[PDB]
């Protein structure tokens, strides 16, 4: 588990500092985004994952991956692939997938 969570801290650090991370560093404000609340049932973002890691809320690295993948599933559900947020989400999703795979 210490091995699991060490990897999680590395990959989240790397995602938080990525150029394409800007749509995911804070929760979407649904008051500012028409339709977000109706369409996205389980919002997720990097600061929520950071907060959860800080309070010890992740037991395994599979839990952590489920949150990361939820970020990018939400992104592809709500944003067009050719939108600014959609393009950034594909960059971040490919980064995470490839980085997760050269560990496990
Ligand atoms: C276009 C709105 C949007 C942002 C976004 O612009 N920001 C993230 C929140 N903090 C400020 C910047 N991020 C996402 C994942 C979305 C949507 C609708 O999926
Ligand atoms: Mg693949």
XYZ file of C-alpha atoms and ligand atoms in Angstrom:
124
model
C 0.000 0.000 0.000
C 2.923 2.320 0.707
C 4.192 1.299 -2.738
C 0.724 1.920 -4.222
C 0.388 5.355 -2.639
C 3.957 6.432 -3.444
C 3.171 5.952 -7.137
C -0.128 7.844 -6.724
C 1.699 10.874 -5.291
C 4.201 10.869 -8.171
C 1.577 10.672 -10.890
C -0.730 13.260 -9.296
C 2.181 15.657 -8.816
C 2.996 15.176 -12.497
C -0.592 15.776 -13.579
C -0.975 18.875 -11.379
C 2.093 20.469 -12.992
C 1.191 19.528 -16.591
C 0.480 22.346 -19.097
C -2.815 20.665 -20.085
C -4.004 20.326 -16.465
C -5.649 23.748 -16.252
C -9.272 22.482 -16.733
C -8.905 19.928 -13.941
C -7.135 21.681 -11.047
C -10.403 22.849 -9.434
C -14.017 21.597 -9.500
C -16.264 22.882 -12.261
C -18.608 25.517 -10.843
C -22.050 24.338 -12.043
C -23.525 27.827 -11.537
C -21.260 28.965 -14.388
C -21.728 25.993 -16.738
C -25.212 25.452 -18.120
C -26.195 21.790 -17.975
C -23.224 20.518 -15.959
C -25.160 19.401 -12.889
C -27.820 17.697 -15.016
C -25.288 15.759 -17.131
C -22.299 14.989 -14.849
C -23.512 12.822 -11.939
C -20.105 12.350 -10.221
C -17.834 15.365 -10.707
C -14.139 14.856 -10.080
C -11.000 16.974 -10.350
C -7.349 16.936 -9.294
C -7.756 19.053 -6.148
C -10.422 16.643 -4.874
C -8.021 13.746 -5.520
C -5.249 15.707 -3.805
C -7.525 16.376 -0.820
C -8.507 12.707 -0.623
C -4.863 11.599 -0.743
C -4.008 14.082 2.041
C -6.648 12.727 4.435
C -5.622 9.131 3.685
C -8.855 8.348 1.792
C -7.282 6.033 -0.826
C -6.723 2.405 0.217
C -5.335 1.034 -3.066
C -3.980 2.502 -6.270
C -6.997 1.097 -8.147
C -9.260 3.457 -6.182
C -6.973 6.331 -7.201
C -7.109 5.316 -10.874
C -10.917 5.179 -10.799
C -10.976 8.842 -9.730
C -8.412 9.891 -12.350
C -10.355 8.080 -15.076
C -13.576 9.686 -13.836
C -12.039 13.121 -14.526
C -11.453 12.186 -18.163
C -14.755 10.319 -18.610
C -16.612 13.409 -17.330
C -14.498 15.545 -19.661
C -15.355 13.475 -22.742
C -19.010 13.265 -21.710
C -19.535 17.018 -21.463
C -16.988 18.578 -23.844
C -16.554 18.190 -27.579
C -13.346 16.427 -28.603
C -12.385 19.589 -30.518
C -13.214 22.021 -27.710
C -10.447 23.687 -25.722
C -11.288 21.654 -22.606
C -11.798 18.474 -24.628
C -8.417 18.792 -26.336
C -6.699 19.354 -22.991
C -8.503 16.347 -21.515
C -7.249 14.017 -24.226
C -3.670 15.148 -23.573
C -4.084 14.551 -19.831
C -5.858 11.221 -20.345
C -3.148 9.879 -22.648
C -0.505 11.099 -20.172
C -2.181 9.312 -17.242
C -2.888 6.077 -19.122
C 0.661 5.813 -20.456
C 2.200 6.747 -17.103
C -0.005 4.306 -15.175
C 1.069 1.579 -17.618
C 4.823 2.076 -17.319
C 4.311 1.392 -13.598
C 1.816 -1.514 -13.639
C -15.445 24.989 -19.736
C -15.614 24.666 -18.258
C -14.738 23.477 -17.737
C -13.535 23.676 -17.097
C -12.779 25.035 -16.838
O -12.762 25.873 -17.686
N -12.031 25.235 -15.559
C -11.998 24.278 -14.462
C -12.537 24.934 -13.184
N -11.662 26.018 -12.785
C -11.518 27.016 -13.811
C -11.258 26.447 -15.216
N -13.033 22.471 -16.756
C -13.865 21.489 -17.109
C -13.563 20.006 -16.832
C -14.968 22.081 -17.734
C -16.164 21.278 -18.272
C -17.506 21.954 -18.575
O -16.072 20.094 -18.439
Mg -4.063 1.787 -24.221
